RNA sequence: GUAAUUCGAGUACGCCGAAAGGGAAACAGGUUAAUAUUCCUGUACCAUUUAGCGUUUAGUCUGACGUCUCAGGGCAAGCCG
RNA sequence: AAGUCGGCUUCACCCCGGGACCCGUGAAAAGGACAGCUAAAUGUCCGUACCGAGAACUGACACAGGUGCCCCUAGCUGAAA
RNA sequence: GUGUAGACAGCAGGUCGCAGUGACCAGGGGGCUCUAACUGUCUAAUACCAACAUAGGAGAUUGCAAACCCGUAAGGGCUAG
């Protein structure tokens, strides 16, 4: 799973920030999205009922950017093409 | 109602225009400290608003892309140049300005 | 990135505002309070390190907004963070 | 009539020794709550107490009243404290201290149950409880003495806010005027050896000393009662 | 309460307490021997009340705030051709 | 009698925003705004002169003291009142 | 030369006087001791000190219907602790 999570980013479309994230979970582009321990569920519990996905992370939005190798913080990180890789297999 | 009698200023308009010209203005006339004189902020402020606003041109007007233009942001912030003069002298003798 | 820490400056740190009044102690005691307070400390609520002293116990996290009651001049203190750990780990146990 | 003390004029209660009053927030206690009731309120605000020099947690409840409450650690606005019988034995919660388990840490510490909160409110340090019975329960007190209270009395769970405010010195005269301006407390203070002997009992003499020893009996009459009152011992620890 | 009061702390209800705190609204000119945002000329503004024409958003905001320091803009005064 | 123009600066005044400190965390209430437009009437009472100080106050005085001060003060020199 | 500017800083040459911050304004300095740490307070009208205060250090009482204190009482200060 240490790779796999990496793997997913490194050859696989995800799209990062709450505000994409939202944008692709009302679109459905996003396969699913994947929500850190500290983000909110006031608009979550409607991405919730929709078919769209919601994985929760191990970790703070501090601490999933830097295991995606984005230097910021990551709360939302609505994946687009899953790649090489199947985590949407490992969500659900 | 007796014409008012001023006080006639010729005198001090000459001498002011010396100043301007940059004399009658020497050690022996300076009598406050360097800061009384010429405040330090101010000082700053015009230098690093020159530097600032030449930067910006320079992005504005393309010879400046982004990546660089943050490294010498933060060195006329941090007081790397003199003046616009010794900025534009630094990119000229690094080549920091995309020519075409 | 910091001052100029000349070969002799590093004693007084923020009490160098005290000249030489009150006495080494004295003024070694309210530094090392002034770099303990002013240390970065992390939000618990987003978990990063933006929570500032606002007022005497009141801090207050510049990007989430949150604000809580804590020590005079640290966020947390050690006694409640004992307080916390004992009942997590009794939270755990059951 | 060798002149009134310094105490005796603090009893008379003249301007120079009243609190200033009309500085302080709230009279800091506990919501009033029937006998098998509970509110729950939450924190809208985290004040500063200049009564106490600690915060103190602004609180709106479902009742309609807005209350200013003793701040715990760890408090945050917008929390949702609980008070009653069954409220969780949680930080900043309300409950009978019959309900919090021996080694808990509370604070503002009622003396008799619906008093309101008493012990325990100074900014940073707490109460523990040690043990429980049926009708008593047992708390080991800041002092170190252990205090037998109702186990009905109420508690805030977790210690009060601004823990180390003593650590800093005040390294300066008027640092702790600024604090001595919100408090009837007169600063500063002449020694008793420096007054005249009609201002105190160790006033005069040609060099400066009390003449008498400095412990006094616990019978002595007001006006009297100065120096160490009824002291065990005397000393620095042996 | 006090032997009692014109005496006494507290509580309850009232009432006062600022010509430098808060605050509804007016300006320029002239006029006299002495008053002038007060009298006169010109041009305004505010409050209630009455009558008609219409009506809540309702409980929020404002009044409403410390010390120090600094940026930007303006301006009375000042200066130059 | 002219009475028309430009430029510079701008405190110690007005607006606005930022930062730092806590160790005094720095008032309250009336009033005002959020739904008002038009037309008539009403807006009572008190003060208002003058000094405000090396002669109008106070110190027995036309007293070298003291008394609120101004969020009052022009040109040159000069950091500058 | 810096700066948008106000201005500020610097350079070269010539030149007069006994003297160029020419008036005005404007520290004399150092060494060795006593004493109090320091800023502060004081005998209004003979004592501005080494005296008082101060932060710091230590001790004592008291768990609050407390310690301490005011009142004859009713009831109060400390304590919106």
């Known amino acids: 799973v240490d790779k796999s999570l990496i793997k997913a980013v490194k050859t696989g479309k995800v799209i990062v920030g709450a505000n994409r994230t939202i944008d692709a979970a009302a679109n459905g582009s996003a396969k699913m999205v994947v929500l850190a321990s500290n983000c909110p569920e006031d608009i979550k519990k409607k991405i919730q009922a929709t078919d769209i996905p919601v994985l929760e992370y191990e970790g703070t939005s501090v601490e999933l950017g830097p295991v995606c190798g984005k230097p910021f913080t990551i709360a939302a990180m609505a994946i687009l093409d899953v790649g090489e890789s199947d985590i949407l297999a490992a969500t659900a | ?100 | 990135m910091a001052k100029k820490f000349t070969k002799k400056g590093r004693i007084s740190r923020s009490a160098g505002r005290f000249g030489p009044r009150y006495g080494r102690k004295d003024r070694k005691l309210v530094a090392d309070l002034e770099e303990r307070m002013r240390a970065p400390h992390v939000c618990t609520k987003c978990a990063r390190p933006t929570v500032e002293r606002i007022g005497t116990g009141i801090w207050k996290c510049s990007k989430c907004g949150h604000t809580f009651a804590g020590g005079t001049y640290i966020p947390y203190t050690s006694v409640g963070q004992t307080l916390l750990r004992t009942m997590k780990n009794i939270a755990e146990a059951k | 009539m060798g002149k009134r003390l310094i105490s005796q004029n603090r009893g008379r209660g003249t301007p120079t020794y009243r609190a200033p009053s009309h500085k302080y927030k709230a009279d800091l206690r506990h919501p009033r709550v029937d006998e098998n009731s509970s509110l729950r309120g939450e924190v809208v605000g985290i004040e500063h107490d200049p009564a106490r020099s600690a915060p103190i947690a602004k609180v709106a409840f479902e009742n309609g009243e807005e209350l200013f409450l003793l701040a715990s650690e760890g408090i945050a606005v917008g929390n949702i404290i609980e008070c009653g019988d069954d409220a969780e034995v949680k930080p900043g919660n309300i409950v009978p201290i019959g309900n919090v388990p021996e080694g808990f840490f509370i604070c503002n510490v009622e003396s008799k149950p619906n008093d309101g909160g008493k012990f325990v409110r100074s900014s940073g340090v707490y109460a523990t409880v040690v043990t429980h019975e049926a009708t008593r329960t047992a708390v080991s007190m800041p002092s170190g003495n252990i205090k037998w209270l109702n186990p009905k009395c109420r508690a805030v769970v977790g210690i009060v806010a601004g823990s180390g405010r003593v650590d800093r010195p005040w390294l300066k005269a008027g640092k702790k005027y600024h604090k001595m301006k919100t408090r009837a407390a007169k600063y500063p203070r002449v020694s008793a050896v420096a007054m005249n002997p009609r201002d105190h009992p160790f006033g005069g003499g040609a060099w400066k000393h009390p003449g008498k020893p400095t412990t006094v009996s616990r019978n002595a009459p007001p006006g009297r009662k100065v120096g160490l009152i009824a002291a065990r011992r005397t000393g620095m620890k042996r």
Request: aromatic share 4%; net charge positive.
């Open chain 2, 1 to 100: 109602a007796k014409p008012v009698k001023g006080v006639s200023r010729g005198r001090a308009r000459a001498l002011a225009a010396k100043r301007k010209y940059g004399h009658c203005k020497g050690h022996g006339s300076r009598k406050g400290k360097k800061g009384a004189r010429t405040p330090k902020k101010e000082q700053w402020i015009k230098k690093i608003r020159a530097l600032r606003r030449r930067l910006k041109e320079l992005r504005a007007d393309g010879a400046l892309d982004k990546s660089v233009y943050c490294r010498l942001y933060r060195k006329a912030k941090g007081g790397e140049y003199r003046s616009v003069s010794h900025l534009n002298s630094h990119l000229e003798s690094e080549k920091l300005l995309k020519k075409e």
